[PDB]
Design a protein around this ligand. Structure first.
Ligand SMILES: Cc1ncc(COP(=O)(O)O)c(CN)c1O
Ligand SMILES: Cc1ncc(COP(=O)(O)O)c(CN)c1O
Lengths: 396, 396
């Protein structure tokens, strides 16, 4: 049966790690990572998270299955985090949240629900986007189309091209929006541009799908949701796939949510029963540990206070590294203006390097970046900043 | 979109649960549960699991992503549990294991791998089987056909009718086998029958898919894989979906595995890359806590000794209840012969009640069982045994 199964290509983010590990050169730097890293080069367990795990160790009396949709307060809490504490969507019971294995899992559940219960045939993703986007929608049997987004010349959101590619793009098509900290560009719409897109979205009959993987990493917990919130005000229907992998450092516990909103309560319950039937035929019911940690933090005000500070420090570390990257570049002799880096948000940016400059830094120097020129600013430390910058000045 | 989504039909097993917590009238017995309960009626955390979780609290320094296929050690220990300590499959490197979200998640990733990389169009499951088998194979786009299994009259394995229905199965079809503790029947093949089914499988060209959700609950760890191991001896290729939800009490942490064996290592390496591509497009990589707990216990001889003892006592509790149920039925005055309960394995048996006898049992009060007649013997305690048997005698 398996004799003539072909190999499956190297994953563009994952494949680079092996290459790295296996290189065993001295002062090598990996900017191809997809995880926050602190000043010392590591990805620690948050203190709030370790305190909430001690609590669970002492209080759990059973590991009996969660409901198909998970922990209830996990769902109340992510609804307030996404839509704000007094949202009409919450008071009018127009939203339903299922706990899922990570943001990727929420995205696959949304895709299987849409494919099996709806007329959606196509989803529009930005060019560029996180490459596993195309694979979850394609696995569910959905066509993915690309809209323009980025200006390589100016390192900006070329809004006009985005709006023009989103023409025609039929009523009943899904448009996927990154809520904040665009991966791979770090270029986000302004609140005026989000409000325009929201208006255009209801004029055109699109179904907005927000991918929210990085809330809290651009400007703040509430600021980062204004885009979503501008759509949620004008739309009857909406889907949000969020992750708690980054803002809680819970990467391997698979903590995310898939939120469904419909015009009203009765319609969200009918549509959410089919979302649950899609979960049941995939993994049945969700991972409890990671999500229990999130519900314990978010609901205990001491713990939450400490988590918010831990998140603020992760956000400020990335902003320091963005200023220090372009300053050191100007100092070591960089030939080009790289100030756009300071404008961009979260852990990713396109460095503005050629595929051949990205192989030059791997081969010659210790520097590892994704072929696209995407670097992760959290991989830079005040310590490796000068050898990294000398190496890219050398390939400019 | 969503305006006219129809409600999903209530899940047979899970739908009874809410009717149960809505009754709240006094000495209600729920025998429709899918989990082990002890003499208290509780589903405890194993103390071996509490001990391994504290070790993880003290020793984890990161929650950074696992590989797509999960924890290594977890994979090796799963293969020795399944295939035995020195099996040629492990020494020839013919097997590859991916850590998965539960036994249901393993079934779904085997199903997407099979639907996307293979000529399989059908899977044969027994009649009866766990209701969710049809649904995960169907969500992957696979046809499920049914082979005969149970003898309603004699309460046995109708072997002649199973061989016969399986002659309709073509080469390149996957046949699904419950490894031990058949759900809902609890009727398992003898080793002589397993060996028959293996030989016949080799010459007719079936692809074996074993679902092993209860290893250790009928006889013992090794005794329970005896059937798997007869197929593994003569087959080039096979797939095993296993769960650690029941023998470890790790239900809501979603701990299972999917094992691929092929003719040789380079073939299973090429096919396993396609399996990992299917995982990546589903939930990206697996939940760490539960599998970390399984690998810690299995790795350490002290913890593994305590676990084996905890599994022994669960297995002996089910066996005592099977005995005490047919004895109490006898002395409470049952006019049917329930001897067959003693012969069956693990938590489930068909009681041999009609649809209208289980409805009246429930309404005329107390006892909740699946419409099918399926009873979970671990929901019976020495305390509720006589009123339960009272009510069953009352309806024959
Ligand atoms: C845009 C985007 N969406 C979804 C995800 C997935 O999140 P998770 O790690 O929980 O799968 C990522 C990766 N972190 C992402 O960058
Ligand atoms: C036969 C069978 N297979 C698979 C599963 C699923 O196991 P899990 O809960 O780990 O997904 C079950 C349910 N426990 C089952 O009874």
């Amino acid at each position: 049966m398996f004799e003539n199964i072909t190999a499956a290509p190297a994953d563009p983010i994952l494949g680079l790690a092996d290459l790295f590990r296996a290189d065993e050169r001295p002062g090598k730097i990996n900017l191809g990572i997809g995880v926050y890293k602190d000043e010392t080069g590591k990805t620690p367990v948050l203190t709030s998270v370790k305190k909430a795990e001690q609590y669970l160790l002492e209080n759990e009396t059973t590991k009996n299955y969660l409901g198909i949709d998970g922990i209830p307060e996990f769902g109340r809490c992510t609804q307030e985090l996404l839509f704000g504490k007094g949202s009409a969507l919450i008071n009018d019971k127009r939203a339903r949240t299922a706990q899922t294995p990570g943001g990727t899992g929420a995205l696959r559940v949304a895709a299987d629900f849409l494919a099996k219960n709806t007329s959606v045939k196509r989803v529009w993703v930005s060019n560029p986007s996180w490459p596993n986007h195309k694979s979850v929608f394609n696995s569910a049997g959905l066509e993915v189309r690309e809209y323009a987004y980025y200006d390589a010349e100016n390192h900006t959101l070329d809004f006009d091209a985005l709006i023009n590619s989103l023409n025609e793009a039929q009523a009943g098509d899904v448009v996927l929006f990154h809520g904040c900290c665009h991966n791979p560009t770090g270029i986000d719409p302004t609140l005026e541009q989000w409000q325009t897109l929201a208006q255009l979205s209801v004029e055109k009959g699109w179904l907005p799908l927000f991918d929210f993987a990085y809330q809290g990493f651009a400007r703040g917990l509430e600021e980062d949701a204004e885009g979503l919130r501008a759509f949620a005000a004008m739309h009857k229907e909406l889907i949000v796939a969020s992750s708690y992998s980054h803002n809680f450092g819970l990467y391997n516990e698979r903590v995310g949510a898939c939120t469904l909103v419909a015009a009203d309560s009765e319609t969200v319950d009918r549509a959410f029963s089919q979302m649950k039937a899609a979960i049941r035929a995939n993994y049945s019911n969700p991972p409890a540990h990671g999500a229990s940690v999130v519900a314990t933090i978010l609901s205990n005000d001491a713990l939450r206070a400490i988590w918010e500070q831990e998140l603020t420090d992760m956000r400020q570390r990335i902003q320091r590294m963005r200023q220090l990257f372009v300053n050191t570049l100007q100092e070591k002799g960089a030939n080009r203006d790289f100030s756009f880096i300071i404008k961009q948000n979260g852990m990713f940016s396109f460095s503005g390097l050629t595929k051949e400059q990205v192989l030059r830094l791997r081969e010659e120097f210790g520097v590892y970046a994704v072929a696209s020129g995407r670097v992760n600013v959290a991989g830079m430390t005040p310590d490796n900043m000068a050898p990294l910058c000398e190496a890219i000045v050398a390939v400019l």
